[PDB]
């Protein structure tokens, strides 16, 4: 295979230099295939608490790389592209969080994992798409401040019956803005297919799906649902993941949806990262100390 040179050297350098490679489900297939662990944000966060390797190469976006670092302050965490980020986070700021705390006195602040580490220092609890409902359900409050994703917060409100105040204004993931007409059309094309969508999708898409869940939840659905065809409403990288796990099922994208930031990582720049052991993820010690609290609370509210 024509990529063999990069694949072979990545595997050699990872072993020689003592790295574990963690990747998100939206990474390109070629990178998923060289990673030691590929999962959703919650699975990556849990893996980050467990792993023993002294050095971590993380393949995803910066806020998750930083979460890995927060949980492993004394390990070296590197990423191949230091600009890979989630655009939804930048609109959420400390000033907005403090404004809303005052506006809603005793409402806990629940931040989605795609948020700056600075913002996480101000959060009561972190969540991911997988556990947001569970986290908010278990909190001792009928009102929560939630951000940055409005769709996820609205889904949480539905599922919990609680008041969810979303910050900032119109925070959303462009990748998951499918139109529900795509579900109508695929219902006609494949009448027995099951439609699985991400909770970051807008409400009419969520409401027309058979299942709503994180990418890790999506991967578990075929363990219990014997359907021959699944239609997948999330970023295109998950198709490869699902097809690998379940070669005897068919996975159809709801629409083509690409996260440009997730695609910044390539075989070439991942090789360069292992050659140079760059770019290290570095945070102020104060940020680690403060942000770890709501991250650890997330795990306390699950189990
Ligand atoms: S897919 Fe959406 S929410 Fe996830 S990193 Fe990309 S822009 Fe952010």
From Swiss-Prot:
Q: Which GO terms describe its biological process?
A: 'de novo' NAD biosynthetic process from L-aspartate
Coiled-coil spans are none
Tagged with keyword Nucleus: no
**Main location, first listed in the record:** cytoplasm
Q: Where does iminosuccinate bind?
A: 24, 41, 112-114, 129, 198-200, 215
Gene Ontology MF term list: 4 iron, 4 sulfur cluster binding; metal ion binding; quinolinate synthetase A activity
Domain of life where this protein originates: Bacteria
Please give the InterPro entries that the UniProt record associates with this protein: NadA, NadA_sf, Quinolinate_synth_type2
**Top-level enzyme category:** transferase
Q: How might one describe the regulation of this protein's activity?
A: Inhibited by 4,5 dithiohydroxyphthalic acid (DTHPA) analogs, which bind to the catalytic iron site of the [4Fe-4S] cluster.
Q: What is its EC number?
A: 2.5.1.72
Its recorded reaction(s) are: iminosuccinate + dihydroxyacetone phosphate = quinolinate + phosphate + 2 H2O + H(+)
Recorded family membership: Belongs to the quinolinate synthase family. Type 2 subfamily.
What protein is this chain from?
Quinolinate synthase
Q: Which organism is it from?
A: Thermotoga maritima (strain ATCC 43589 / DSM 3109 / JCM 10099 / NBRC 100826 / MSB8)
Gene this protein is translated from: nadA
């Amino acid at each position: 295979h024509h990529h063999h040179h990069m694949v072979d050297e990545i595997l050699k350098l990872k072993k020689e230099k003592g790295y574990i490679i963690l990747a998100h489900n939206y990474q390109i297939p070629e990178l998923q295939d060289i990673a030691d662990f590929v999962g959703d944000s919650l699975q990556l966060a849990r893996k980050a608490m467990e792993l023993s390797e002294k050095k971590i190469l993380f393949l995803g976006v910066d806020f998750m790389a930083e979460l890995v670092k927060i949980l492993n302050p004394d390990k070296k965490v590197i990423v191949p592209d230091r600009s890979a980020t989630c655009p939804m986070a930048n609109r959420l700021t400390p000033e907005i969080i403090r404004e809303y705390r005052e506006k809603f006195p005793d409402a806990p602040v629940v931040l989605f994992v795609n948020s700056t580490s600075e913002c996480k220092t101000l959060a009561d609890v972190i969540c991911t798409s997988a556990n947001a409902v569970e986290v908010v359900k278990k909190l001792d409050s009928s009102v929560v401040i939630f951000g940055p994703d409005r769709n996820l917060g609205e889904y949480v409100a539905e599922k919990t019956g609680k008041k969810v105040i979303t910050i900032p204004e119109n925070g959303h993931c462009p990748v998951h803005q499918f139109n529900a007409e795509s579900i109508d059309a695929v219902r006609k094309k494949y009448p027995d297919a099951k439609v699985i969508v991400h909770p970051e999708c807008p409400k009419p898409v969520r409401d027309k799906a058979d299942y709503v869940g994180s990418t890790g939840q999506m991967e578990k659905i075929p363990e219990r649902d014997p359907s021959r065809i699944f239609v997948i409403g999330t970023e295109i990288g998950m198709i490869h993941k699902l097809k690998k796990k379940f070669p005897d099922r068919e996975f159809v994208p709801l629409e083509m949806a690409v996260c440009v930031n997730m695609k910044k990582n390539t075989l070439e720049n991942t090789l360069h990262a292992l050659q140079t052991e760059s770019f290290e993820v570095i945070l102020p010690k104060e940020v680690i100390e403060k942000a770890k609290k709501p991250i650890l609370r997330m795990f306390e509210l699950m189990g």
